[model samples]
Target: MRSEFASGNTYALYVRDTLQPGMRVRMLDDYEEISAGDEGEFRQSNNGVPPVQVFWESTGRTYWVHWHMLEILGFEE
Candidate 1:
């Protein structure tokens, strides 16, 4: 995963999808206020329609989750 500086106090993780343009494989979290102490678990689909439709966890609820598109140039492996 990578980081974005535009997110201010928060951060974004880029999940890349090479087969689709203007479509990200996944986007984890938005521009929400984050601190070092705050922590949670989540799952996102790169191109999910009904967000978190494939959640599979036995012990935690997803938090600060979202899906967004990005202007990516390439993907690694």
Candidate 2:
């Protein structure tokens, strides 16, 4: 239910904006191909509810996740 391609320079300047990619995350949804605990890294956000795209750590596949549905545990360089 989310996505983004805009690399808004001024947009990310907003507070709590876009988790700023590489921030470690795991999707909490169970309905998707990627399991709830599959490790992933932030990619880009729509700047709302942290609706961001991520790189699933196991396969480097891109997936979408949200705030309550994500657990920010670490960073990836």
Candidate 3:
């Protein structure tokens, strides 16, 4: 399924509001114990105990983060 963010929307606005698709976000961590300020796009989600997915655009990487920890930077293409 797909999701989108709307203006004045609540945290549960979208079906997957926790991490709306097409949304942009800045990585608050780089695993190097530093604020990398890395940017990426919210792609897909997976189902599991708590559910998760790869949400970053950096190269040579695959990490999972709690959707709630992501900073919603608004919508994109």
Candidate 4:
């Protein structure tokens, strides 16, 4: 996945083998034809942080997953 350290722009995506300051991603669903750019959102951290997730269906692109903020986590249940 892409992060601020890896990108100068606000929106970008890439596949990351190691965890970065971003969302923990999983393929809830798969599609063969989908466009890129601010794909989606989801809840992750609990530091009252806010939404932190994104998606890109174009599975074969350079930087298919991206992040927009520093990693924050406080959720527990």
Highest lDDT among the candidates is held by which one? 2
Question: After superposition, which runs of candidate 4 have C-alpha atoms over 4 Å from their true positions?
Answer: 1-21, 33-77
Candidate 1 Cα outliers beyond 4 Å, as residue runs: 8-13, 16-50, 60-64, 67-77
Candidate 1 per-residue lDDT, tens place, 1-77, comes to 33444652122233323323323223233333432223333334445342422221322333333433222332322
Cα displacement (angstroms), candidate 4, residue 74, comes to 11
lDDT of every model, 2 decimals: 0.32, 0.61, 0.50, 0.31
Q: What TM-score should be assigned to candidate 1?
A: 0.22
Per-residue lDDT of candidate 4, residues 9-71 (tens digit):
333222222233343344332433424221232233222222333432234332232234322
- Model 1, position 35: C-alpha lDDT score: 27
Output the lDDT of residue 51, model 4. Answer: 33
CA lDDT, candidate 3, residue 33: 28
Best-to-worst TM-score order: 2, 3, 1, 4
TM-score of model number 3: 0.49
The alpha-carbon RMSD values of the candidates against the true structure, listed in the order shown, are 9.4, 7.9, 7.5, 11.7
Query: How big is the positional error of residue 38 in model 1, measured in Å on the Cα after superposition?
Result: 14
Better of 2 and 3 by TM-score: 2
TM-scores, one per candidate: 0.22, 0.61, 0.49, 0.19
